[PDB]
Amino acid sequence: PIETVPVKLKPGMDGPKVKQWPLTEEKIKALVEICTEMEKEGKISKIGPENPYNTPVFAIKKKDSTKWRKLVDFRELNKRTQDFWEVQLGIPHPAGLKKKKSVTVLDVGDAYFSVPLDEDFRKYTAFTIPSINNETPGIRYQYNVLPQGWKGSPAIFQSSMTKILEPFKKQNPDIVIYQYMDDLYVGSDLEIGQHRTKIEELRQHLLRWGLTTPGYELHPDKWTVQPIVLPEKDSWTVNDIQKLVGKLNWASQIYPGIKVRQLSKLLRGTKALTEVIPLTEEAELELAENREILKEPVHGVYYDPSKDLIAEIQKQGQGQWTYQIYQEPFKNLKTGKYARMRGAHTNDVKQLTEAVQKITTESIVIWGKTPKFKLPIQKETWETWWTEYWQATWIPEWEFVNTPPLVKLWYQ
Amino acid sequence: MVPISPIETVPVKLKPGMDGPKVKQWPLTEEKIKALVEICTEMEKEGKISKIGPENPYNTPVFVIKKKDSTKWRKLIDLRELNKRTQDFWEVQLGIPHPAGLKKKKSVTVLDVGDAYYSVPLDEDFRKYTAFTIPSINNETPGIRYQYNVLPMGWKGSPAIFQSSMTKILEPFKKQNPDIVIYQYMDDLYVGSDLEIGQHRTKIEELRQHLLRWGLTTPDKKHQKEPPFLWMGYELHPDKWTVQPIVLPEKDSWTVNDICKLVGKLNWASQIYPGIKVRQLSKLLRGTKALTEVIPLTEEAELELAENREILKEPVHGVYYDPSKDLIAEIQKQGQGQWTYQIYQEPFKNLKTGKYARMRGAHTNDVKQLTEAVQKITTESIVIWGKTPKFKLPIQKETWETWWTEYWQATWIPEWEFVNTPPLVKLWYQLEKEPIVGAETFYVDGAANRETKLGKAGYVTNKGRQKVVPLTNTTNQKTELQAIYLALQDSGLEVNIVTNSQYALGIIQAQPDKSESELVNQIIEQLIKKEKVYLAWVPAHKGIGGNEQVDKLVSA
DNA sequence: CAGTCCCTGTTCGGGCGCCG
């Protein structure tokens, strides 16, 4: 008997209609068990084909969890609700969260099940559960409460949430707390043990409101960037200088102060690639000045809240991956490298999956947004395997690129 | 309450601001007219149909087709205009069951619902839109107007409503009988238990009573107590299954429509018959105008069709699924981007077979295509069995390792082992990571005039070797490839090549072994003959070395 | 600095096969 906030789609936009993809027997068993209990508790109820909207569903295990978590791919719905959770009931972003020595992430998704959902909106949360070998037709449901992974859930529940919070905010005025979808980011500057302890306190506070909390610990101050770097060589072949000029010329789209004139002079002839070329003093100084510029920041790179984040990833080999986050081309808000992630040297898709997750997490902490990924993989290769390695409760937007690397500019 | 209500109906609105169908009836031949009138009058006694006064201002055509393998006729109401204006549904039929999915069962019963569409009530408010006008032997007698009281064949909401309604009815019985397997596909029900045959039939009849309660009738005529069962186009035996026999047209002269039927049958056959190849038969269908047009068979499509027919000569069968044993998929390269595979558990006892022939990309190699086939098999397996088979692949472990570690795209194959069945899949050539000492360095470039389509391709080298060649009806891209082809032709077994063409460098670095472009194929031919090739890229128009000089030559 | 042209790759709707 709680009031239901009415919700509407962005004007001129119909509800999501997205086919359910095939699921493994292990995932289907988990979903059937999860949905049976949710139906019994009234969180969801069965629906007919007259509802014309569907959203994909699947199950994940969070890192080390071993316990299945239902996960709905609400990206299409969230795009059609978009104006609602931005222009009205949204959450501000604590610019200080990235500065805290430790940040823990908690899954508060269960809380959303408390609140009910606008009766007119429930038609849009429909999801079908498939059957192995199509023994049965699809078993369709819809949500009677606030669904996990929908972007209206944290907004509708923000009023309820802040009240549950405010006692703990007032006992610790220095602890920063941020809410992104199903997750609560809790950032303290405390020492490790005190930090973990304060997390238990915020757990109990959630407990006396009837919310269960089954955490991820970050260290955003450790986070660093990956500068463009130029090789150090005792001797330079013609091929080496040709590589260097190509990298510097591309880099000049980012740092306009890069100059290749004196380095180009070294390759005036028509020379064998392996011929050793002594550097002149003028080129040594031009190269020195260049290395310094690349240490510097790009002029006038600042985050813009209106514009979308874009993430680009490159596979550098040997378990190493490089990424750039930006909004405008060549104005990069961050650039980084990942190495020796899970699956290194055996599984590219597991590694790319881990990379997408880590990059999305940083964007949530730094900017409270998730970027759109340009993924260096074939669409069919990614779609076949990615869910197998996914351990997060959100799902970013992605697209697929096929661009081979004419210059290894980012790694070295 | 003139008409009784039987089971939970499904609300069905029209599309907003739109109104019911009106369109005049077909000039139906009197022979057809006889069949409809008898059945339609019978419906009214049951309550399936009701008469309507002209207060119902809706007319939609109607027609009838003979039931295949029966004397009976099927009564179809065309609703193309009503579909257009009826609300959209979400289809609940997510695919087709495959017999290879089925586990072995001691007792199997297949039963068919009778008048299944007609046994499901249509939405009361929506009933008005059904209206159609009956025909007479002459045009003098008007004929009665009728509105369906139940689902009508030919609507676009009929299958999903029936399937969803059928599942709801079955669900209580399934919950009381957790160990019975019911494959529900439309109105056909497959029931399997490990109960002994007498006890199984008790459940079967007990299930029949349950369906009767909702007005669903299972006639004995379509009841299938005894093997071999006929189910989804397959013949089911206690330990094996096979497709119901496939007849391939014998025509001496083939039209276009002929090849389509042929091709589509051979695709159906390839789910069990290993090694079916449709490549050359499909080549005949590319870029043709008339479905009626006659087309002659090449000696390629003929040889293909010959061995395809011979594969069908011997009977083959698949087995059933044993969850205890592993799933194994083995793949063979069939040439010309054709791949076949077998999925099995016991060696030589196949669950099913299949083929992957899709040509993807203008330039590709066998390793990419094998990766595509592995993905197609993996998704197909997850649908049928919910797990990924172990793979036996005709590619050396080191070949795969060299490809995936070096490729710039993320790529992966699930757990697999090498099978030494030729032809093995390999990389035909490898580009060097570093420049080759003592190998001649070819600076290559080409340019072409957008208007004239004239161009030059040429090279310059550190030894002083030079060439420029004029070309006609070309493009900038084509001349950049040509320059590289020239450097490869005119070089020794080891060569360094410097290009500024990102286009060409991208094609060649992906190690293609086949291409749509003949020019790329020739470049491949040369790459294979070399011992060492180093390709390097520099930016154009930067005053670099040989690149500047060759740029001047080809620009001229 | 737009506007093309190449070239590639995706998507989508057509035909057929198969199942109700």
Add this chain to the structure above:
DNA sequence: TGGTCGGCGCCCGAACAGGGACTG
């Protein structure tokens, strides 16, 4: 006679997206 519905599969060709290189 020619004519309906949904599902899945294949192979096709056309229509569309978008990224570089070059033209003014």
